[PDB]
Amino acid sequence: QISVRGLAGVENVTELKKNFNRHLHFTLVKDRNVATPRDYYFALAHTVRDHLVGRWIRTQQHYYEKDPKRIYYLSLEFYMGRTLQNTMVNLALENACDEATYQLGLDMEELEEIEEDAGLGNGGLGRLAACFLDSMATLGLAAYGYGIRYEFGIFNQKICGGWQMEEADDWLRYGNPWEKARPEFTLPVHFYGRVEHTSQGAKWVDTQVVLAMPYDTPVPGYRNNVVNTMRLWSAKAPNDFNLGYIQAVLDRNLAENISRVLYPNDNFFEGKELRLKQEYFVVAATLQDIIRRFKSSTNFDAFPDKVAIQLNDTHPSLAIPELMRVLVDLERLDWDKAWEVTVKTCAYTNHTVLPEALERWPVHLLETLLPRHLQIIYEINQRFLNRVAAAFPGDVDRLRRMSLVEEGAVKRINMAHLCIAGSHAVNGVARIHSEILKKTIFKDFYELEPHKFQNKTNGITPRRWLVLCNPGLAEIIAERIGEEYISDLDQLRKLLSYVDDEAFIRDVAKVKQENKLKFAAYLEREYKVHINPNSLFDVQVKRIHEYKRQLLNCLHVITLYNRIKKEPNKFVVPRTVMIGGKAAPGYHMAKMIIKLITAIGDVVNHDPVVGDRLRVIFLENYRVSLAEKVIPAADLSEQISTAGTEASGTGNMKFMLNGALTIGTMDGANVEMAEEAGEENFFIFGMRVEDVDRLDQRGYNAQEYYDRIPELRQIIEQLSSGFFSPKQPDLFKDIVNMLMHHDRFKVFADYEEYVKCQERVSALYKNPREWTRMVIRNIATSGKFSSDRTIAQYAREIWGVEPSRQRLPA
Amino acid sequence: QISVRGLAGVENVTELKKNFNRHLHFTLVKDRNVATPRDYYFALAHTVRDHLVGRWIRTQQHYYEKDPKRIYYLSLEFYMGRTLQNTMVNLALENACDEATYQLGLDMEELEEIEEDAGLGNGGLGRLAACFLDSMATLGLAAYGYGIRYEFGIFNQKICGGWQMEEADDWLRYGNPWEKARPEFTLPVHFYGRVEHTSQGAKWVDTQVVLAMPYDTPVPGYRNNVVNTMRLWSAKAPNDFNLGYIQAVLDRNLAENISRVLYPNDNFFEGKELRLKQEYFVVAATLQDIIRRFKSSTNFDAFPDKVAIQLNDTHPSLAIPELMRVLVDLERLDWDKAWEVTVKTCAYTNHTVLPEALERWPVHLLETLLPRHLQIIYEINQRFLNRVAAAFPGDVDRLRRMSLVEEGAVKRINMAHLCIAGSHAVNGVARIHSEILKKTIFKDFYELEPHKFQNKTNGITPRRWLVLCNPGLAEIIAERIGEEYISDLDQLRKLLSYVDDEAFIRDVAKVKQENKLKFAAYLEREYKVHINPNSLFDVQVKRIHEYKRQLLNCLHVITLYNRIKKEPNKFVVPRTVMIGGKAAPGYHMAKMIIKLITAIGDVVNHDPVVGDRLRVIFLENYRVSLAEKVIPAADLSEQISTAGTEASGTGNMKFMLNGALTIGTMDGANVEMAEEAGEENFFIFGMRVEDVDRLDQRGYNAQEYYDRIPELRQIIEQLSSGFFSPKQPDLFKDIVNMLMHHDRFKVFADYEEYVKCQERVSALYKNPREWTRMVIRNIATSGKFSSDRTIAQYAREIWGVEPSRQRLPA
C-alpha cells in the first residue's frame, strides 16, 4: 500500500501464507473452523518470529568470532509495549504480512490489537531502556539488555466513579511468543547468611539460594540483519527448598515472589525488602553471566576492554560492590586492582534531582540480607573519604556530605554516592539537568572528579515513534527526501526547504486530520465517548506527579470554562483537552488529581451552553500502545513541569516528531527542543530555573497570587465551595490546602503566563496555514532527539566503541 | 531393527530428519554446535507431536458429527509416566524415528531417558486411569480423562543414610511439549459464600471465584488413528483478586495453590481443606465443560443417553451433589427428575476396604466451603433413608449404618455412601474384592439395591507393559503368532502350543537374560551398585504399606542370611532381592520399613561368607519409568498382601505378562491369575480370606508364633538386640513392638508357609528348562488382564456403549 512499509513480493506473500497455515495447524492445534482472532494473532506472531531466528543465531555467533567489547545495559525496567508491528517494521515485512493476511481474509490491524503490552516499566526511565535497545541493535553494537521478567507489569488502570482503580496486569496469561526460556543457563543467587573470616580471605556462608532462570527476547535492528538479546531473569525455588511436606512445597512461592511484580511507585523511594531482593537478584545473576562470557572468549586487566556495564539509575547499583565481591573474594585479586577494574567497567545515569526519589537503603536491611556487601560498601566509603580528606584538608563538613553512609535516626546508604564513587562516568539526561547535577546535588563530587561528569541528552527511536505509529507522516516525508532518514534522523532538516511548499503544507495538515479522525473513532468504539475532530487536540499524557503540574492544566481548563460561561456568545477556538496517566497506588495527591480531572469533565462535558467548544477527557490506562495512538493525533503537547524538576522528558520528543506544537517551560529537554526549532516556533512560558531560585530565597507565598488574580480566586472558590462536587462539597479540600499552603511546585506562580501563552496558541490555530508551517519547522528540526544520536554519544564518550551502520549478511 | 517397531521407509526417515532439523532451528533456536542432549530430545518430541495433530483434530470433529455417547473419566490421579516412546509405538513410528536419529548421529534411547515422568499419581489407582485412557482410545470410545494439572507430582525419593528423603518433583521445569494450553476455555469455580432462599429457589451468593484453565494432552489409540483428550485443570486467580497493592498481587498465590501439588498420602485419609478444594475444583470445572458440550450438540431427559461419568474412587464424589445443584438451582428441574438423571449418569469404582483410607469429610468443612452442597447432601440423605425405612420397617440400626451422615464427636459425611446412593453402578476391581464389598462394608446397600453391584477386574495396557518396555519378548511372540495380539491379548493362548518347542523355550529364556543384563548395567551406571546377573531376580515393587507386607519379605531375606551363616559351605540358589517403593511422608511405620530394608542390605551385602549368593537392594525412586525397566528383568514377582486387603493389584499383571513367576497369597487379582494359569503354575501360599476371619474370631496372638518357631525367634532377637543397627541398638523397637503386639496384618501367621513356598521357588529355578516352561504357561494365559478387556466390560455393562476396533482415515 505505502512505500516505507516494504515490498509485497509474490514469493514472500505465498511463503508467509503457508507458514501462517502451518502454525495455525501444528502450533496452535486449530483449523479455520474453530479459530478465534487471538489464534490468528498467534499464528501471525509465530510466522514473523521464524524470520528472526536465523538472524538471531548468526548475530550471536558473529559476536563470538569477532569478540568485540560487549555493552551490558542493566535496568529494573524495560517498557517494551507490543512486539509484532515493530518486528515487521525492522524486518521490512509489514506490507508482505498485510497482503498475506488480506488474502487469508484477515485484517492485520485487528490482529495487532490482540497483543498485550510488555508493560515492564513505569514511564520515562523504562521507555528509555526500550528505545536504547532498538538503537543499539540498529547501530550494530554487541549489546545486551538485562532485567527482571515480571509476571505482572505496571497495573491496568480502570476509572470507577472518577477514581483510579488498579488491577493486575496478567500479561503472560495467553503466553508470550517472543521469549525463549533458557533453563540450561540457570544461575544461583544468594541471600542472608553471614560473613566468616579465614586465613585466606572473607567467606560468605550459610546463605539461602534462589535460582535465576533466563528468558531471551530478540531485539532486531532496523533492516541491518542484526538481532540482539534482551535477557530477563525469572526467580525459581531450588528443589530441596524447605526440604509439613505440603506446606514445604507451597512455601516455594516465597522464593519465586522475587520476580512476581513491578514496583509501581515512581514518585517516592520506599525501603521495602522485596524491592532490595529484586535489585540484587538481577545484579547477581547478570554479573555471573557477564564473567562467564568473558572467560569463554584469568587476566582481569582486560575486563574493562571487553565489558561495559551501564546502570539505569541507582536501581542496579549493587553491581559495584557485587563486582568487587566476585573479584576479591572469589578471584582473589587485591583490592586496588579490583577497584580499578570496577570503576573502568561501570557508568551511572541519573534521572531526577528530586530527593524523595533517591534510593537510600537502611543499613539494617543490608546487614541482614547482604552482610558481605555492607562490609564492602563500608570499605569503599573509608577509602573514598580518605581521598576527599587528602584533596580538601580540614573540610570536615564536606566529609559528612560526601559520605556514602548517611547518619541519623536510621543509618542509610546513599546509593547515588556509591554509583559516583564506583563509576568512570556519571551523566544527566538533558543539558540543563546535567548542569544542575554539577551545581547542586553532586557539586562536591564534581569538584573532586570533574572528568567523571557528562551530559547525554535523551532521545526516542524514530522506528516505533514515527514509522510504526504514524506511517502516513513517514510516507509523505519519504516522498520528498527518500527513506534514509529513518536511521539518520538529522536528514529531516532537508524538510526546511518545503516550508513554503503548498503541496507539502496540504499533505502535512491532511495526515494530522486523518490521525485525529482515526483517534476520534477509537474513542467512540472502545469507550463510547464523543469528540469533535475539528477542535484543537490539547493533550498531556505522562505519569501523574505534582511536579509535572497536571494541576496547572486543570486551572487553565476551568478558566476557559468560566470565560465561556461569562460570555457565551463570544467565539472561542474549540478544544478537546485530553489528560491521561497512571498514579502510583500510594500517592494520595496524584489520585486526587485524577478525580479532579474527571470531576471537571463531568461539569464541562454536560453544560449545554458550552456545546462542542470545550471537552475534557481523561485517557484511561495510558501505556505504550495508547501513546502510539494519541501522539500522532495531537495538535498541542503540554510539557509544563516547574523549571528544574523534569530531568529530560521524552514524551515531548515524541510529540515534536509527530507534528504537534509544544507549550512548555524551559525545563529538561524542552530547552534543547526550543533551541533546535527556534524560540519563535515554540510556545515557551513561565519561570526559568533562576526565577524559581529567586522565589525560594524570598519565600513562595501562594496567597499573593490568590489576592492579585481575580480569575484564579474564582477557581479556588469553586473548588472549595463544592462546585465540582455538589454531593461532597469538601472533596477537594486537600488540593486547595496544598495549593494555598504547601505547594513545592509553584503552580500559582506560572498561572498568568500560562493562560496568556495559551491564548497565543488558540490565535495561531485560527490560521491553519501558519500553524502547519510552524509544525513543519518543528518536525524538520527534531533529528537531534533520535536515540540513535544518544547511543552514538554513549558509545563514543562512555563505552569506547564505534557504532556501525553496516549490514550483516541475510 | 525388529518387526513390531514398524517400517523405516525412505520417505518417512527423510521427512523425520528434516522436521527434526526444522524444530531444532525454529522451535528451540539452536544449531548443532550449541545443542545439548535435552535440546535433541525436545526436537524429537516436537517432531513426533506433529504427527498427532491432524489425527487429534479429525478425531474431535468426528465425535462432533457422529455425536456418540461421551465417557467422562474423573480422577484426581493420572499416573502417565513418559509420553515419547508410547506415542511412537501407537503411531508405528518407532523404527523410523530410530533410523532418522541414528543418521543424524544420535541414540534415541539416550534421548528418551531425558523426558520427565508425568507423575500425577500415587500408585495403582492413578496408573489404572492411565492404562484406561490408552484402552478407551484403542477401542474407539469418545472418552475424555479429566483431572488436575499438578505443578508438582509425586515427590522424588532420595535415600540418605538409609532413610527416605522427599524432594519436589518439578516436572514442568523445562516445559511439557505434549500439552496445549486452552486459556479460551477458562471456567469459573466458586468457593465459600452463603445460601440465600428466594421465592423461586435457592441461590448461592457472595462466593470467592477461582478460575480453571484447561490444558489438553493427546491420548493416541493403538494404530487406529484415534486421538482422544486428557484435559487437566490449572488454578488461576481472577484479575481483580484482592483488588497494600504489592501484597494483593502476591496473595494471588493463595488461589493458585489449589493445583500446586499432589497429595502423596495413599494410606490414610486426611481431612485437609486444600484437598477438598482440589476435589471440588476438578468436579465443578469438569461438569460445566460436560454440560456445555451436551448443549452444543434444554431437554435433560436425554442427558444420560449422551453422558457417562465414571468416578475413580470417591475423590470426585462431589460430582453427584454438583450435578444436582446445576440441574435444580440453575436449570430449574424438579428434584426427582434431576435425581433420575444424576443416578443414570454416574457410576462409582471402589479401590479398598481398609477403613482408614475411606473419605469421611467433617461437616464443618463442607458447611464453610460448600454450604449449598451440604444442604443438597442432607436432602439426598433424608430421601435415601426414607427408602431404607420403607424397605426395612423397624430396622433402626440399619438406618444409622446406611446414613451418609456419620454421628460422633465430629459429624462427617461418608463419601462412599453418597456414591452408592447417587450411582446406577458400583464396582470392585477384582472378583474377590467385589464379593467382599457385597458381604462386608456395603452389605446393607447390596441388600437394598443388588442390581447396582458389579465386578470389573482390573487390567493393564499391553502397549506400555509389553511392546514398549519389553520389545524383545514382543518380537519373539510376534514371530510365532503374528502381531494382532497387541490389541487382542487373548491371542496369547496360542502360545500354549509352543510349551514343548525347544526353539521357543530357548528364545523366552534368552530374552529374560538380556533384560537382566541390561538392568544389571543400569544399576552400575546410574547407582554404582553391583549385582550377579545369574542370580534369581526376586522383586517386590509397589508403595510401602503394612498390608502389602514388605516386612514378610524382610523376614524371609533374614532367614536366608541366617541359614547361610549356619551352613556356609552348603549350596543355595543365588538371589538378588530387590525391594522398592515410596512411603507416604507421614506414614512413620512405612518409613521405618524402608530403613530396615537398607539396614539388612548393609549387613548382607558386606558379609564375606555370603559372597554373591545373596544381595539386598532398595530400588530408589520407584515410578512408572523405573517399572518399565525392572519388571522385564524380574524372575520372581512378590505379591504377598494379607488375604482380603489388596483390592486387586496391577503390578502382579505386569510381571505375569513379562515372564516372571508369581509368589503370592490368594488376594485381589492373584486369585484370577492363578485361575487363568493353573494353580500348578503359580506359587500360592498362606491364609485364605476365610482363615484370616477364623483367626480374628479367635484373636491373633503373635507370641504363639514366636514361641513355636525357633527361626522366627532368632530374627526378632536380632532386630531387638541391635544386630542390624550396632550403633543404635533400639532403632527397630517400633517394628518389633508392632509385630509382637499390634499387627493388623498377621505377618507371623504366614511366615512358615512363605519360607516353605520360597524353597519350592529355588528348587524350580535350579531346573532352567522347567522354570521357562512354567513361564510360558503364565505369559500364554495373561490375556484376560489386558485393560482392553476391562474397558470393553465397563463399556457394555456400565456405560452402554459398543467398542470399535475400526480405523479412522489417516
Ligand SMILES: Cc1ccc(C(=O)NC(=O)N[C@@H]2O[C@H](CO)[C@@H](O)[C@H](O)[C@H]2O)cc1
Ligand atoms: C523509585 C523510582 C522508581 C522509578 C522511577 C521512574 O520511573 N523514573 C523515571 O521514569 N524517570 C524519568 O526518566 C526519563 C528518562 O531519562 C526522563 O526523561 C524523565 O525526566 C524522568 O522523570 C522513579 C523512582
Ligand SMILES: Cc1ccc(C(=O)NC(=O)N[C@@H]2O[C@H](CO)[C@@H](O)[C@H](O)[C@H]2O)cc1
Ligand atoms: C486417600 C487415598 C488417596 C489415594 C489412594 C491410592 O493411591 N489408592 C490406590 O492406589 N489404590 C489401589 O488401586 C488399584 C487400582 O484399582 C488396585 O489395584 C490396588 O489394589 C489399590 O490398593 C488411597 C487413598
